[PDB]
Structure formats: structure tokens, C-alpha cells
RNA sequence: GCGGGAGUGGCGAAAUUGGUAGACGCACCAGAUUUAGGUUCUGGCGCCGCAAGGUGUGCGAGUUCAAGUCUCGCCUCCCGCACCA
RNA sequence: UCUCUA
RNA sequence: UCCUCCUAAAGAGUAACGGAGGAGCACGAAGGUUGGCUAAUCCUGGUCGGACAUCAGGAGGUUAGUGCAAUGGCAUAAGCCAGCUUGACUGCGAGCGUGACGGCGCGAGCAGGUGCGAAAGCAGGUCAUAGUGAUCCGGUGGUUCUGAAUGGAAGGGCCAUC
RNA sequence: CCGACUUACCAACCCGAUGCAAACUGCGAAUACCGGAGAAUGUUAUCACGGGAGACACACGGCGGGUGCUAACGUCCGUC
């Protein structure tokens, strides 16, 4: 179970987040995906944050 | 004294039965969205008004009677919904 | 003692032994020893009857063995209760239906083949008979 | 295109004569020349592969295709996907011009050259030879190089049999023996 | 009878998650020391073999690109356990 | 400093 | 506990200290789409090069491949390369399957916004079936929903999540 | 160096002939099951909701089988 879990925080200022997993050993760089934000009803870049 | 007791069996396991098969047979009127066949592969294939699911499940996209038929050069078994 | 070299699986169900046989006609040689009864022949019974006809022909002529023991037979050891897995493979049998040609022979006279196959069938549990090569 | 013109004018008339073909399209012709360098020693360093492709690019003025392992074998200590060789396919005019420089310059520059083999035609006309040493081509500078490579030349032609290719190359005065 | 474990060169012993196998040491061989032997010092040393390479972890197949290490079966040795009436 | 035996 | 095959008696299902094997993950590409491609093995020839690297031709025709076990599938490829990308979207969901239940599954289509493609169209994770854990309690962010005189606040609720 | 030939230690592929398989299938039933139509028959025998239960230790016999020795008034399943 090396594949830890993270969250993809919206860059739209909202605290909306998708949750997902990654291998932090082999992929040290941050994951950035363009996902849908249901609050703004737009596709916005989400960035990796800690699952906390 | 004497009950030479012993043994075992590394072979106790099995999984649950997935209840596959053909849920609606031929000449059998269905509603749209009704599951016809649940299956692993495409042992059957989708014809007219019949969709193939994520798990190769054959469901009806429309209403009507189920038609089993063999087409193609490979003699594959197609399931179609006749109109009704 | 005949035995398969490899097997895909080590054990087998007990099964049944119903039906008629298939190896009915004398294919290769001239004379044959045909099974009339039903049962299973072990590898020991097969090799003992082979020895009895090889000695009865003084290694004259050619002997075919049409059957082959491919069924493993398990037994549980003594003072072992009926649970706790299937027993250990002890010996190998061939299921014999009526009509199965067991042995064939040529290069010898008919009367010599009769007395050799009689000495062999006296070592076999099932009841046999003597057959010859039929045209068609 | 000196040899392509010499083909089109004299070889076709020659082979139509010495084979009595119904059609002129039935004649053989060369199709491609493949230049492989199997470099199994690049597992030590990439630079051996990287410099052998530079040498083979001077021989034939193309950038070579670095070939890789089709599968993994343990006798050679390679895994499926390792860059393990280099090839060049030559077609057209660059094929003819290399084939000219080959049979005119490089084959005479072979040390103790005494002919080729006529037993190198793969049953179906396609000829294959292997050179021991890349310095026979004058593209390579002798002081500038360090390592004696070797490559192999494979002439793929449209000849059905083996002799029709043997006669075709003999029509190009190819030094068999 | 049940279970846990191990089987490597003449010998004791190593090896890791599969990427050659003998590191090491003892013995044995040879050299030089010595009047000689031992010690002590140096150098070699798994098997067939032409100097160049091949076969080689108990036995038999498998797995894997590739096994001493993975499977399975057979075997041998050790240990422990084999109880209530 | 050690230094056995024939 | 979960998955695959047999037993299992040609619908489903079906037991035993019955016969055999696996799972307690991985992947930010190993996903989506567009475009293209088609194996294993063997034969002959060929520098180092060898049973076995790479190269060319021929037989063969999927005996290969599928991230991993088995089964079923797979050429329109679900297999293999490259380009662009994030549909590994949010709210719903007719209608069916499966279970004693809790629950699990398939799903066209609808609204929004998006990606590839000229376009028709495809995409709501991976060829499918294992890769998992109820509730309570507690934590984090968001949200005036509530707020024990009133205004706030604490705390609670709801949404997401651990 | 090439190896000269002949052996008996065999033998790949291929071809012909011949068997076996629960975990083989280029074939393939009978029955069973699902659906539709139609009579006759049957005290709705069918389904839904609600009130009350009991029961969840089964046995033998037939057929199809696993296990066992195709041993057991044995054992475990399917069906009557
Ligand atoms: Mg007991
Ligand atoms: Mg090793
Ligand atoms: Mg006592
Ligand atoms: Mg003295
Ligand atoms: Mg069934
Ligand atoms: Mg049935
Ligand atoms: Mg049966
Ligand atoms: Mg495509
Ligand atoms: Mg080669
Ligand atoms: Mg894909
Ligand atoms: Mg898969
Ligand atoms: Mg509690
Ligand atoms: Mg308020
Ligand atoms: Mg208040
Ligand atoms: Mg069968
Ligand atoms: Mg009970
Ligand atoms: Mg009970
Ligand atoms: Mg009872
Ligand atoms: Mg019962
Ligand atoms: Mg009964
Ligand atoms: Mg029984
Ligand atoms: Mg009984
Ligand atoms: Mg009873
Ligand atoms: Mg029964």
C-alpha cells in the first residue's frame, strides 16, 4: 500500500477538492489536472495538496 | 496410543456464484434498459438496439422482442431487439 | 510397470465404467485377446500377462498392448478416519469395457496364440475371449 | 544514378536475353540495401552506439535508425527494449550511389580482398555480406576513429530465384569469386 | 503418524527477494627457509577439457529472459509432538 | 621476545 | 474474507477437513480520443556474434500478447506505436440483474461544462470478473441550516473527506 | 584440421493406424428451464398486504454424482 492519498484543491478560490492517490516515490512532481468545479460550473485547474 | 491423527487440505477455497447467463430469452418482450445477458467476454455480441456494457453485459436500448441470430464470417452470435 | 510419465493433475474422480468399448477390431496384429467382462486392469496385471505370453511365445512374434493405465487410484492409509483430504495415489488402472481388445499378437501360429492368451487371461480379473483379424 | 542508367540500358537487355522473359517487368531489380551494425557492447556505454551511428551516417548519408531488442535474453544480458543496434535502409538514388561507391572503392580497399561468396543468397536472390572493418570506406578518417566497427550489407532485390540475382550482380560486375 | 527446518567443493561454511557461486577459512599441492621434519612465509586449488570454452547447490520434471533462492513430487537427516479415557 | 623433534 | 476452474447432473443456484490455483495491488499513464500497425516459433544468408542480440527474405497464421491467478473474450482488435489531452467530469437517471437484509451491479438517456476528431461520433477510469471493512466515536475544510432571554459564539446538522 | 564409414543408444518433425480425460472439445442430444399462443379441467389452486406460528437435529429408498474400498443401516450434494 505504498500509493498514498492526496487531494486536488481547486485554484478557483473555492475549497472544493477531489481526492485521489499517487506514488510519491516515483512521481515527486505535483499533479495538476483540469477538472470540473461544480460550484463555479467551469473547468478549473486543480493542484495537488495533502490529504490531511 | 494408536490414533495416527493427521492431515489437512490446501484446497478448501472457492468463490461465489455470479449468477450469469441469459436473463431474457428469445421471443420475450423487454423494456428498454433490460439486461439480457450477463457474461464475462463477448460470448454474445450486440446487434440492433442492443448495447454492450462495461462488463460485456448486453442490455436493451429499446423496447421489443429479443432476437438471437448468427451473423458474420466468424459465425458469432448476435442479440438484437426487434421493434414492437 | 506402465504409468504415465506426466499428468496434468495428480488425482481423479472415481467415475463410472459404463458403456461399450471402442477398440473392438484387431487393428495391428493377427490374433487378439478381447475383453468380455467389465472392470479395471492394473499395471501389474497387465505386465504379468505380458510376461506370460512373451514367455509362451519365446519372444517369437510381435505383441501389441492396446490398453494403457492412466487413471490414478487413491487409498487412505490404515487407521485413518474418513476425512482430512483425499487419499494418496497408490496404483494406476485402465477402465475396461466389453469389447476392448487388450492385446494383439502375430508372427506365431494360431494354436500358440491361443495357449499364450489363455495363460495371460488366467492372470487377469476380467473374463476374456480369443479373436482373429476379420476382413472388414 | 550512373548505375541506375546502366541498369536501365544494358542490364535489362542482357537479362531479357539470357533468360528469355516474356515481359520486361519480369526482370529482377534491386529494391533496397540494409546496413546493420549489431552493437551488443553498448550495455557498457551508450557512446559506443552513439559513435557507431555517427560513423555509419558518414558511410551512407542518412541518420541511422537505432534498433532495439525484440525480446529479452539472459545469455547476452539484455532486456526487451534496450538499444542494441543500428540500421540504415537505402533506397533510390542514394542506394545506387552507395552501391557504386561500394563495388568501386570499398571492396578494393579490403585487406586481402580475394572475392565474395556466391553462397550468400538466402535461397531467394537476396544477397548478404559482412565487412570486417569500416575503414574501407573513405568517409571515415583513420586518425579520427578509435574503434574498429563492423557492419553487414544486405541487398534485397526482386529476383525470385537465387541465380537471377547472381546474374544481376554479375551484370554489375559484382566480385563474387 | 503430524508439524518446523536443512541438504551446496575433499571439509566447516556464505550468498537475497531471481541478475554467475564457491567470499572465507581448514586440509591438499608446489616453492623458498631448515642438516631434515613440523612450524612459519609466498602462490595455487570445484568437474571435462585443446588455453579456448563448456557441465556443475540431493533426485525429476516445471516457472522465469534468467533459479542455489520460486513452485510441486520423491528422498535423506534433525528437532518437536504423538494426549483423555 | 620466541625458538619443538630426529 | 475475496477471486478463477471442476465437482454442479447442457437456465440460475447447489455441500464436504472434496480436487487444483490466486488476491489484500498497480497505473497521472498502463486512462480518453484520433491516426496507423499486426504476432509466437522455425528456415536460409549474413563482421565481431555465440543454442539464443541486431539485419534481409521465406514458411507459418495468433500456437503470441493481455500489469498480475484462472476462465471467458479479443483482428472492427480489448493486442502494439505515435499526436493531442484529462470524461480517472458534477447533478440525475427510465429500466433491469442480484441478494433474507444491509447492500452490490449494469445502464441508455437528460442538464451543465470539457477533451480528441474534418466529421459521423467516442469518453461518467483501465478486456471483464479479486485488490476489501458496517456503525459508533473523533478529526479537517466548506456551508448562517440550527443557535436554550436577545445579538454573536461554542456545539450540533448537511456536503466533501480522513 | 576435415572428419571416413558402420551402428544399435536413440530419436525430433511429419505421415498413417489406435486408445484415454472431472478441471480437453473442430461435434452434440434426451430432459429441464424461460417466453408466447390455444382449448379442456381444477372449490383461485396464483399474487399482494396484514394477524398468529412453528421449524432451521432429519431418516431411508430410486436416479445423477463427490469422498470412502463404486465398503457400511457410512458421509456430503442435486432430484423424486
Ligand atoms: Mg482428532
Ligand atoms: Mg547467483
Ligand atoms: Mg493418563
Ligand atoms: Mg633435540
Ligand atoms: Mg449450471
Ligand atoms: Mg442442470
Ligand atoms: Mg457426471
Ligand atoms: Mg486505434
Ligand atoms: Mg542471426
Ligand atoms: Mg487501451
Ligand atoms: Mg484485465
Ligand atoms: Mg462500539
Ligand atoms: Mg442564524
Ligand atoms: Mg442565543
Ligand atoms: Mg466433459
Ligand atoms: Mg442451526
Ligand atoms: Mg441442519
Ligand atoms: Mg443429524
Ligand atoms: Mg440432507
Ligand atoms: Mg436421496
Ligand atoms: Mg455415495
Ligand atoms: Mg452407501
Ligand atoms: Mg445415514
Ligand atoms: Mg445425490
TrEMBL record, chain A:
Q: Name one GO molecular function term.
A: structural constituent of ribosome
Q: Which family does it belong to?
A: Belongs to the bacterial ribosomal protein bL33 family.
Q: State whether keyword Ribosomal protein applies.
A: yes
Q: Name one GO biological process term.
A: translation
| Alphabetical list of Pfam families matching this protein | Ribosomal_L33
Question: What keywords is this UniProt entry annotated with?
Answer: Ribonucleoprotein, Ribosomal protein
Q: Which GO terms describe its cellular component?
A: cytosolic large ribosomal subunit
The name of this protein is: Large ribosomal subunit protein bL33
- TM stretches of this protein: none
What InterPro entries does the entry give? Ribosomal_bL33 (IPR001705), Ribosomal_bL33_CS (IPR018264), Ribosomal_bL33_sf (IPR038584), Ribosomal_zn-bd (IPR011332)
Q: Which taxonomic lineage is given here?
A: Bacteria, Pseudomonadati, Pseudomonadota, Gammaproteobacteria, Enterobacterales
Amino acid at each position: 500500500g505504498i500509493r498514498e492519498k492526496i487531494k486536488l484543491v481547486s485554484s478557483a478560490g473555492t475549497g472544493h477538492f477531489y481526492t485521489t492517490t499517487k506514488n510519491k516515490r516515483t512521481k515527486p512532481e505535483k499533479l495538476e489536472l483540469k477538472k470540473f468545479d461544480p460550484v463555479v460550473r467551469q473547468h478549473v485547474i486543480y493542484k495537488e495538496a495533502k490529504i490531511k | 496410543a494408536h490414533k495416527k491423527a493427521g492431515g489437512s487440505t490446501r484446497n478448501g477455497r472457492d468463490s461465489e456464484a455470479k449468477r450469469l447467463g441469459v436473463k431474457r430469452f428469445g421471443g420475450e418482450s423487454v423494456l428498454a434498459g433490460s439486461i439480457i445477458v450477463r457474461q464475462r467476454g463477448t460470448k454474445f455480441h450486440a446487434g440492433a438496439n442492443v448495447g454492450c456494457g462495461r462488463d460485456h453485459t448486453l442490455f436493451a436500448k429499446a423496447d421489443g422482442k429479443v432476437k438471437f441470430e448468427v451473423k458474420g464470417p466468424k459465425n458469432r452470435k448476435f442479440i438484437s431487439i426487434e421493434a414492437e | 510397470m506402465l504409468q504415465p510419465k506426466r499428468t496434468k493433475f495428480r488425482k481423479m474422480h472415481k467415475g463410472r465404467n459404463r458403456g461399450l468399448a471402442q477398440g473392438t477390431d484387431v487393428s495391428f496384429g493377427s490374433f487378439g485377446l478381447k475383453a468380455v467382462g467389465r472392470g479395471r486392469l492394473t499395471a501389474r496385471q497387465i505386465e504379468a500377462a505380458r510376461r506370460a505370453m512373451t514367455r509362451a511365445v519365446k519372444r517369437q512374434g510381435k505383441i501389441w498392448i492396446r490398453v494403457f493405465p492412466d487413471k490414478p487410484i487413491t487409498e487412505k492409509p490404515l487407521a485413518v478416519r474418513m476425512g482430512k483430504g483425499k487419499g494418496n495415489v497408490e496404483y494406476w488402472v485402465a477402465l475396461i469395457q466389453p469389447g476392448k481388445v487388450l492385446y494383439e499378437m502375430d508372427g506365431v501360429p494360431e494354436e500358440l496364440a491361443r495357449e499364450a492368451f489363455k495363460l495371460a487371461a488366467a492372470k487377469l480379473p476380467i473374463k476374456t475371449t480369443f479373436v482373429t483379424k476379420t476382413v472388414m | 544514378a550512373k548505375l541506375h542508367d546502366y541498369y536501365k540500358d544494358e542490364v535489362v537487355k542482357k537479362l531479357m536475353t539470357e533468360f528469355n522473359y516474356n515481359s520486361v517487368m519480369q526482370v529482377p531489380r534491386v529494391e533496397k540495401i540494409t546496413l546493420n551494425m549489431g552493437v551488443g557492447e553498448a550495455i557498457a556505454d551508450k557512446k559506443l552506439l552513439d559513435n557507431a551511428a555517427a560513423d555509419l551516417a558518414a558511410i551512407s548519408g542518412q541518420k541511422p535508425l537505432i534498433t532495439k531488442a525484440r525480446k529479452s535474453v539472459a545469455g547476452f544480458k539484455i532486456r526487451q527494449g534496450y538499444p542494441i543496434g543500428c540500421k540504415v535502409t537505402l533506397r533510390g538514388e542514394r542506394m545506387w550511389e552507395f552501391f557504386e561507391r561500394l563495388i568501386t572503392i570499398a571492396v578494393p580497399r579490403i585487406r586481402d580482398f580475394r572475392g565474395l561468396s556466391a553462397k550468400s543468397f538466402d535461397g531467394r536472390g537476396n544477397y548478404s555480406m559482412g565487412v570486417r572493418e569500416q575503414i574501407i570506406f573513405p568517409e571515415i578518417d583513420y586518425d579520427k576513429v578509435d574503434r574498429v566497427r563492423g557492419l553487414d550489407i544486405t541487398i534485397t532485390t526482386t529476383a525470385k530465384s537465387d541465380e537471377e540475382g547472381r546474374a544481376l550482380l554479375a551484370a554489375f560486375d559484382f566480385p563474387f569469386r
